[PDB]
Amino acid sequence: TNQLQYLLRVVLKTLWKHQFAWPFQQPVDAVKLNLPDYYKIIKTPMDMGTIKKRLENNYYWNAQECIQDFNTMFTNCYIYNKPGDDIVLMAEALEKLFLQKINELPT
Amino acid sequence: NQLQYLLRVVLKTLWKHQFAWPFQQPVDAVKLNLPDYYKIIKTPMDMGTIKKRLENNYYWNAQECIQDFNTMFTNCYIYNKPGDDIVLMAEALEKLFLQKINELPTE
Amino acid sequence: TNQLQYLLRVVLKTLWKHQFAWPFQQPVDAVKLNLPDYYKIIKTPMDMGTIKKRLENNYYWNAQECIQDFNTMFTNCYIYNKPGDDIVLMAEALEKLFLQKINELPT
Ligand SMILES: Cc1cc(F)cc(C)c1Oc1ccc(C(C)(C)O)cc1-c1cn(C)c(=O)cc1NCC(=O)N1CCOCC1
Ligand SMILES: Cc1cc(F)cc(C)c1Oc1ccc(C(C)(C)O)cc1-c1cn(C)c(=O)cc1NCC(=O)N1CCOCC1
Ligand SMILES: Cc1cc(F)cc(C)c1Oc1ccc(C(C)(C)O)cc1-c1cn(C)c(=O)cc1NCC(=O)N1CCOCC1
């Protein structure tokens, strides 16, 4: 099986279905929340919404580039928020699940 | 790629046909007052969805796409009486599907 | 690498950034601009928008089909408009650039 297929049909599907996915399914809406510093501090934004489109529209060079985007999504969240926030536990849980599913990856 | 063939040849052929229109998007059970449709048919399918899936790198391979076309025809034959307009249209389209699927490459 | 991937991430990216891209990012709206003859003279219309959808959705059989589309876009423009017209000077700059990027295509 292709790596990128797996990332779409398996890795991403699992994370998307998951309970805590909703804040990561579209980008952080800085106006709606009142956080003018978000686009200042977070240099390269990223969300599963974006990732899903990239898989569906032939953007990624290799599976290593799609994984990059996942880590950036997580690392972004951890930078901008203080540990033990609500959002951060959510991210942490998703990254747990994410990292499980990478290890099953085709080879 | 056989998937290319299913998009560019098989699906265009079927979509362009006169009988396609009821199979180009889901059956809208609300509009038809068919509240039993979504309870009887458990995997609904249509060319709208199939098209989307080919355009968005969903399928594991050509043979999963063929499964979807079959599910489309057989859902029709499950829900509807034989000899109904809808069922004769489905049969027309399936005949034409089987012709086009024969000249499939082997990759 | 796959050449289609190159056409998406490098060629089309570069052309779409460019200052003169905007009139070529969607079909030439003959009704808006008030050109009844455009669609009689131009038998195969084309634009960077349609090429993009096509790259994003697995439409192209191979990379030479995509390259023809880019060439149709320019020639259509030279056919329909007069020399010295602005749109032609724009397309000419875009074509220049297109041809540079095409000379670093994977093989
Ligand atoms: C504000 C908030 C309250 C809450 F109880 C739970 C969450 C996840 C939450 O965070 C979000 C809620 C909605 C949205 C929308 C739909 C606008 O994209 C985003 C977030 C949010 C998402 N992500 C990925 C973040 O990194 C941060 C988000 N919220 C800003 C935030 O965490 N805070 C606002 C002020 O700083 C402390 C808490
Ligand atoms: C209702 C109907 C009348 C007709 F003269 C021809 C058709 C094809 C027809 O079927 C449909 C018409 C519209 C739509 C829309 C566009 C709303 O999705 C769907 C169908 C239809 C499509 N498919 C694939 C089906 O299996 C069944 C559909 N309609 C309900 C239907 O045919 N019946 C409902 C119960 O009575 C027996 C027949
Ligand atoms: C009309 C016009 C005036 C102008 F000052 C600069 C341009 C590029 C221009 O051309 C277009 C402007 C907008 C649009 C929109 C965005 C609506 O589709 C299209 C064009 C246009 C684009 N392309 C690719 C063409 O080949 C021709 C276009 N316009 C009609 C046109 O250029 N002419 C109309 C008849 O007179 C000679 C010039």
Contacts of B56 in chain A (CB under 8 A): 56-57
**Cβ of residue C81 lying under 6 Å from some atom of ligand 3:** yes
Resolution of the structure in the document, Å? 2.9
CA angle (A97, A52, B71) in 5-degree steps: 95
- Distance between first and last Cα of chain B: 6
Chains that touch C (3 or more CB pairs under 8 A): A, B
Residue with tokens 């880019």: C70
Q: Say which of A5, A57, A58 has its CB closest to residue B60.
A: A5
Residue C36, min C-alpha distance to chain A (Å)? 35
d(CA A23, CA A74): 12
Q: Please give the method by which this entry was determined.
A: X-ray
The CATH number given to whatever domain includes residue A92 is 1.20.920.10
- Decide: C30 and C38 in contact? Cβ < 8 Å: yes
Domain that holds residue A95: 1-105
**Cβ of residue A79 lying under 6 Å from some atom of ligand 1:** no
Contacts of A58 in chain C (CB under 8 A): 4-5, 8, 55-56, 58
- Decide: C50 and C23 in contact? Cβ < 8 Å: no
CA angle (C73, B5, C99) in 5-degree steps: 25
Whole-angstrom CA distances from A38 to A21, A34, A42, A89, C49 are: 20, 9, 6, 19, 31
Q: Minimum-distance ligand to the CA of A25?
A: 1
- Residues comprising chain C, all counted: 107
Q: Backbone dihedral region of C44: left (phi > 0), alpha (psi from -120 to 50 degrees) or beta?
A: beta
Beta strands in chain C (DSSP E): none
d(CA B11, CA C11): 29
- Decide: B25 and B45 in contact? Cβ < 8 Å: no
d(CA A77, CA A90): 10
Whole-angstrom CA distances from B88 to B35, B68, B79, B98 are: 23, 19, 13, 15
DSSP B10: I
Q: Both tokens of residue C101?
A: 């990027």
**Cβ of residue C75 lying under 6 Å from some atom of ligand 3:** no
- Alpha-carbon torsion, ordered B79, B37, B18, B53, to 10 deg: -110
Domains identified in chain A, total number: 1
Q: Which of C37, B47, B57 is nearest to A58 (CA)?
A: B57
Long-range contacts of A66-70 (CB under 8 A, 24+ apart): A66/A4, A66/A7, A67/A7, A67/A102, A70/A98
**How would DSSP label each residue in chain A?**
--HHHHIIIIIIHHHHHSGGGGGGSS---HHHHT-TTHHHH-SS---HHHHHHHHHTT--SSHHHHHHHHHHHHHHHHHHS-TTSHHHHHHHHHHHHHHHHHHT---
Q: For B43, what's the count of Cα atoms within 13 Å in the CB-facing half-sphere?
A: 9
A13 alpha carbon – ligand 1 mean position (Å):
22
> In a 3-state reduction of DSSP, which class is residue C36?
coil
Dihedral sign, CA of B11, B14, B17, B20? negative
Dihedral sign, CA of B64, B65, B69, B75? positive
d(CA B95, CA B55): 24
